[PDB]
């Protein structure tokens with residue numbers, strides 16, 4: 001019987017769903033995979049619980065803090081470009097923006113980092129899908145907008161990237177550029193098929209980034225950057241918590257043994273909490 005992938009109708013969701021689908025068929029010759037369109041990720045998980053679906057593809061940023069009984073995140077694929085992208089028709093990068101320029105972003109994480117470096121900037125809300133966001137930019141509603149580099153590259157929109165904002169300039173959200181896969185824990189047929197898609201290097205990084213995030217707070221509603229490289233077998237984790245208006249920014253660093261990756265994040269988060277990260281709310 002065909003393996004079903006629960007996915008939204010959005011271009012990004014459809015791409016990620018097809019990515020795993022193709023990856024599955026490449027690793028397992030003769031395997032049948034099909035996509036089930038749906039309609040707040042709860043609806044996706046219910047379908048898997050109701051046996052209307054097998055696995056679901058998520059961006060690691062959008063993976064919830066709590067998994068319903070019977071489910072969980074068992075796989076993390078090879079990571080794409082983790083950092084933010086600067087998108088403007090009239091400008092190249094951040095420092096080329098005039099004082100009081102209008103930069104659309106709905107992300108508390110991206111906003112707090114911009115106001116920190118340049119408080120002068122006027123930050124306006126940005127909503128809609130990827131195409132809708134670009135549509136507003138061409139309408140002159142913004143001087144510039146900031147989108148994830150991964151999303152644009154996967155949509156072949158890569159020409160819309162004027163400059164790559166480095167992790168130093170803007171710290172990526174937890175698991176940004178990383179694609180995770182969720183399924184039924186006790187489904188061994190699926191667990192065994194999703195095993196080759198798992199990237200060990202990427203896995204330890206994101207699972208380290210998560211533990212840091214989880215300790216502080218959940219979801220994307222909170223202005224928290226979480227990003228980790230790995231140098232050889234050593235994991236370098238950087239975390240960020242700050243005021244949305246760019247008042248104060250609390251940064252931290254730690255360097256890992258590869259095995260303690262989950263323990264690193266929870267310790268660094270506790271380290272920041274003692275440094276005033278708790279008072280930020």
Ligand SMILES: *Cc1[nH]c(Cc2[nH]cc(CCC(=O)O)c2CC(=O)O)c(CCC(=O)O)c1CC(=O)O
Pocket residue numbers: 059060061062105106107108109110126146147148150151173175176177178219220
């Ligand atoms: C977690 C929250 N979701 C949104 C939009 C979002 N989520 C995932 C992606 C793709 C990147 C990836 O695959 O890792 C995107 C698109 C994007 O532009 O990042 C974002 C907020 C975007 C916004 O315009 O506000 C994040 C919030 C965050 O990153 O802080």
Ligand SMILES: [Mg+2]
Pocket residue numbers: 010011012013129130131
């Ligand atoms: Mg989209």
